[PDB]
Write a protein that binds this DNA or RNA. Sequence first.
DNA 1: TTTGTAGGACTGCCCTTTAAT
DNA 2: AATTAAAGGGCAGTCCTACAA
Length: 96
Amino acid sequence: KFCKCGVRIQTSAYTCSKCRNRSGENNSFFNHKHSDITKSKISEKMKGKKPSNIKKISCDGVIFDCAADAARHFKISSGLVTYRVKSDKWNWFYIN
DNA sequence: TTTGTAGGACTGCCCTTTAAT
DNA sequence: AATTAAAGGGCAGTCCTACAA
Ligand SMILES: [Zn+2]
């Protein structure tokens, strides 16, 4: 049997693995909901990590891995970090 | 039988902006 | 002006499941 893309697939295969739509309603887990257990599991394994979208910062010399560390260190809200980094009154900038 | 797959369904952690003080 | 709690918007890592192999 031949697949819509042209390659030969098993008579039972609805499409080659390469043509298989897995987006939206086509995903095998589409419209499903996760249990409180699964949620809890995921939760535990994500604890301790840092997202890829952090920004190294330098507080007039003292550098941190992310704004949150800068905030937790100075003991301020994360929004105030943003404020200062933009204020001309502070020497706070995000590192390359 | 078993395995691989990819995106849906989620998470922690993150950054910014807004309201309200 | 200075500050913060929430709401807005993000990202890769985890789980989960039907289907090709
Ligand atoms: Zn195909």
